[PDB]
Write a protein that binds this ligand. Structure first.
Ligand SMILES: *Cc1c(COP(=O)(O)O)cnc(C)c1O
Ligand SMILES: *Cc1c(COP(=O)(O)O)cnc(C)c1O
Lengths: 350, 350
């Protein structure tokens, strides 16, 4: 029986026999062999899609929060506090509810938008609209953590990356060896960092004989790592990776460098093409940001990057049900047809 | 290790060693012990939530579609077809894509509300807006199946209920025994029927020492099974159970009678309370219809139904990410607070 990532990989995590485990059975997500997709893009090798959208709150972030909240409970924290309007906030809230802890979200009145906060809110998170600026409100978040037993779960929390490395463990456990390449979307770059650390651990332990080349992918209008300098106003339909100054920038470059990989960019058009193709070839629905990994692969295929026979794994970071707006946006118009058998058959290719 | 429900429960299904298995790794969803929820509603026993929202397309229907589509391939069908605007169509489309088959959806141009078809469409379903009624489109779908190798995957397809019975197998496998009661939402009633069939099979094999009383739940504004007569214009915010003339009506009545349970109703207000409470006490986000099961449980606990010590399982049929509109609707607007630490702290109460 699957019982969460902490119980499965406890010997690799900063926990012990007394650490309280707050889990929603995250992890152990499908590693789907995508032969239809491979044929559709002309990739002469095996493609495996790690479908993280099936995690409890719809994002791989759950891997980090289970450990982060568990450690918080162990430390006697009475609540968690966040300053995010995305998957981070929803994930932290879910685990806080599971742990019986309070969850607080402080954001500037301007960054508030119910659509992006509904999930976190239903989890029980108390959202405050700070009548001020972004950094204005982060100061308040900081002051709370310094003065009260409230756990800050921003990027600064080291347990998030630690829990996230378990995705690499699962790929290696399932395949029996590491892939030749691992494709992953890159926003704040914590995930690519985590996977690399995960692969190195299994390698240092002798569980795998080779280390995958880490191929990270950013959206064109928000590719500070690819360019080498921060992006003031990052732009991209893939909200999850719309980051101008990634928190884990340094470790991400090290991961690409050590693994012999690279962090590159793809356009929103290429991202949407992959987003749709993944669903129409394999019946796997991920969110736009997740598709960047496959879009990256498609790009390299067309450029004649591969020699043939390589094994590639792609992280589909979030559930496509996370983004109903983009889903509706890419939908063509339903073809209108008269109530006539023969006409219908005519429209269809019969 | 998990490879889908067909491979896991092959001996219980109408398949042989030569049947092509089209799977998306559906099934084996978390059976979450909800102690926080139990304490929150005063239930003096054990509550387990079967979180079906984590299935590949967001609902338990994936269990039926994996078999239905696999059987269609085996039969040499070139496509699948239905006339649904809900989870049925999305599920069928995803499995058709996985199987490399085409998927067609015929619906009256009227009911066409894009948000409800976006998922089926991204999976590659070809949706036709028929300038007629539901009955006109239904006859065209029938004529298509009688004249072409296109598999009808609506309610009449027997494989859906067969694949769905695996949910009960999983519950019994995980617990090592059957629950005293099983709470489940009831729309067309195929799921309740499937679970009952599943429990009886394990009982007959001796894998369980008891048979669960089946407790089905409908929304009061659409409870034809409860009232005994079709509901011309069913109403409820829980769209997945907004069914006025359930296809498996007779089977549901039999399941309730034979198991010693019953099919009852709960108000939308009671459903929404459950929907929110499940999320805030456990960090589990299911869609409204799914919450009907817990709402039913809450109703009975308050009415003094239980005696204490009973084990109850609840099927949370769909992912909360399936219904963004209701999620936004139940959310209170964030509280506006000045950028003053003491004020913020005063608002939260530390
Ligand atoms: C957070 C998130 C990302 C970005 O992850 P990083 O570690 O910041 O690069 C990508 N996709 C989804 C769905 C996310 O939630
Ligand atoms: C189909 C569906 C139901 C109703 O299932 P029935 O077997 O028709 O009673 C309930 N919830 C969700 C999420 C569904 O997709």
């Amino acid at each position: 029986r699957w019982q969460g990532i902490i119980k499965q990989y406890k010997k690799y995590l900063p926990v012990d026999e007394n650490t309280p485990i707050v889990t929603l059975y995250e992890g152990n997500t499908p590693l789907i062999e995508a032969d239809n997709l491979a044929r559709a893009i002309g990739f002469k090798g095996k493609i495996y899609l790690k479908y993280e959208g099936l995690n409890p709150t719809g994002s791989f972030k759950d891997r980090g929060m289970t450990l982060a909240i568990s450690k918080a409970v162990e430390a006697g924290k009475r609540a968690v506090i966040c300053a995010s309007t995305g998957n981070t906030s929803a994930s932290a809230a879910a685990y806080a509810a599971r742990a019986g802890l309070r969850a607080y979200v402080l954001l500037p009145k301007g960054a508030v938008a119910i659509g992006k906060l509904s999930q976190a809110m239903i989890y029980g998170a108390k959202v405050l609209a700070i009548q001020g600026t972004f950094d204005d409100a982060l100061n308040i978040v900081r002051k709370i953590g310094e003065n009260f037993p409230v756990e800050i779960v921003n990027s600064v929390n080291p347990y998030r990356i630690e829990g996230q490395k378990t995705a690499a463990f699962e790929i290696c456990d399932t395949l029996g060896e590491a892939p030749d390449y691992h494709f992953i979307p890159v926003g704040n770059a914590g995930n690519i960092t985590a996977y690399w650390k995960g692969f190195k651990i299994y390698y240092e332990e002798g569980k795998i004989t080779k280390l995958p080349r880490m191929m990270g992918w950013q959206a064109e209008g928000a590719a500070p790592i690819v360019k080498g300098y921060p992006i003031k106003n990052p732009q991209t339909i893939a909200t999850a990776i719309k980051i101008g100054n990634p928190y884990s920038w340094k470790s991400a470059l090290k991961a690409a460098q050590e693994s012999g990989g690279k962090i590159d960019a793809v356009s929103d058009s290429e991202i949407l093409y992959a987003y749709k193709l993944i669903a129409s070839t394999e019946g796997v629905f991920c969110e736009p940001a997740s598709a960047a990994s496959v879009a990256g692969l498609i790009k390299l295929v067309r450029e004649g990057f591969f020699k043939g026979g390589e094994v590639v794994t792609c992280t589909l970071t979030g559930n496509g049900l996370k983004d109903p707006d983009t889903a509706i946006k890419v939908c063509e118009e339903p073809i209108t047809v008269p109530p006539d058998f023969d006409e219908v058959v005519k429209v269809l290719g019969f």
